[PDB]
Amino acid sequence: MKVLVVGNGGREHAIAWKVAQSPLVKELYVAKGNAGIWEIAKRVDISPTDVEKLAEFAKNEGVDFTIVGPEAPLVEGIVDEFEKRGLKIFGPNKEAAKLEGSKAFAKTFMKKYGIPTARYEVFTDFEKAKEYVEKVGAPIVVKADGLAAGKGAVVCETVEKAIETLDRFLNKKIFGKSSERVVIEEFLEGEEASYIVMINGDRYVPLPTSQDHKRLLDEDKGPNTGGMGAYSPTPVINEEVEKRIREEIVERVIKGLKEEGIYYRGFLYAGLMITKEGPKVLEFNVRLGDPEAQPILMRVKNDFLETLLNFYEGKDVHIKEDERYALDVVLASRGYPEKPETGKIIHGLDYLKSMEDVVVFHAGTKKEGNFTVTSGGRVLNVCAYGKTLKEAKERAYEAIRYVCFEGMHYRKDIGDKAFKYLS
């Protein structure tokens, strides 16, 4: 068949990489892609968020199946549009999208339905927010309601930082139509980790477990980014903790969707905090995370295309998780996250293509002639397998020594939190 991935980023490289592996696909299109994806997939030069021109293109072209990468297409109703046009597409519809696409919706779900989450008041007047920060204190945490391109949640150490944040969101509306409603939750402590499932109505298959590293620098310092690296499986989520997420989060999220008559066909990624008091939802995402998809997807041993197709229509599916660990180290350009400098030649990619058990997932890459150059803030994911995490981490830094672009920055400590739980 003819499969299409929507998105341009390292997640979507992962999606098409794993998919190109299935003997079922005969042509692979990506809607826009990056220099990395173009080695495998026809580039379609239509924006991911250009949802009606996407659908018509996929309709004329005869695209037999399509998977969505990023949140914004999902949310703007891509799924709705595909269906108009008789199209098989994996991802939530626009109505189901609201679990990410409006935070205070999901926060009302979660409490209307018993899912462990962080104490919340939702505010649309700037003045009524104001004294609730000084009423319950510092901690606190302040979040835009809509897509702010990940750029929307603000952990505040002081009340002043919190009000300053609320000011930019609610008064200045930096974020537009999506900052004019806030969320103020308690700051939770513990290890964060991610749980990911595919949901199709009332069935759900889990996905490899995974931990992201959001901060820029080594020892969890610097600005907070979209993720600088991930690894799978994370030992943060036990047996006992897993057993808990499934019961207390996913299956409640499952009754809730029944009780609202909201039909969910897609990925659901809980971003969690494992507190001492149990696993809690910090947020819901309606797609794979980036860079978490990358190692999750390395660890999917069976034909993911076929599992998608099959899950897609009510059929019955499993995941063989690979027994090797998978670690993905993110290469950023100078200036990331606030203003990334771009245009830099990338050298030594061809050395990584003969290195055992290394996998490169392009982020921000485009072509300038016969050069591969940076296009963006996050550029490369140099990933690897290991019999242990130690090995996965070592093989990913070994690989990195061969590759390079001016300005390149990466964290050296990806996986490091897993080593206390391991032996």
Swiss-Prot record:
Pathway: Purine metabolism; IMP biosynthesis via de novo pathway; N(1)-(5-phospho-D-ribosyl)glycinamide from 5-phospho-alpha-D-ribose 1-diphosphate: step 2/2
Name under which the protein is recorded: Phosphoribosylamine--glycine ligase
Enzyme class: ligase
Cofactor(s) it depends on: Mg(2+); Mn(2+)
Span of domain ATP-grasp: 107-313
Binding of Mg(2+), residues: 283, 285
Statement: the UniProt record of this protein carries the keyword Cytoplasm: no
Alphabetical list of NCBIfam families matching this protein: purD
PANTHER family: PHOSPHORIBOSYLAMINE--GLYCINE LIGASE, PHOSPHORIBOSYLAMINE--GLYCINE LIGASE, CHLOROPLASTIC
EC number(s) recorded for this UniProt protein: 6.3.4.13
One family name in Pfam for this protein: GARS_N
Species the sequence originates in: Aquifex aeolicus (strain VF5)
GO BP term (any one): purine nucleobase biosynthetic process
Key words, A-Z: ATP-binding, Ligase, Magnesium, Manganese, Metal-binding, Nucleotide-binding, Purine biosynthesis
Record text on cofactor binding: Binds 1 Mg(2+) or Mn(2+) ion per subunit.
InterPro entries given in the database record: ATP-grasp (IPR011761), ATP_grasp_subdomain_1 (IPR013815), PreATP-grasp_dom_sf (IPR016185), PRibGlycinamid_synth_ATP-grasp (IPR020561), PRibGlycinamide_synth (IPR000115), PRibGlycinamide_synth_C-dom (IPR020560), PRibGlycinamide_synth_C_sf (IPR037123), PRibGlycinamide_synth_CS (IPR020559)
SUPFAM superfamilies, sorted: Glutathione synthetase ATP-binding domain-like, PreATP-grasp domain, Rudiment single hybrid motif
Catalytic activity as recorded in UniProt: 5-phospho-beta-D-ribosylamine + glycine + ATP = N(1)-(5-phospho-beta-D-ribosyl)glycinamide + ADP + phosphate + H(+)
Annotated signal sequence range: none
GO molecular function list: ATP binding; metal ion binding; phosphoribosylamine-glycine ligase activity
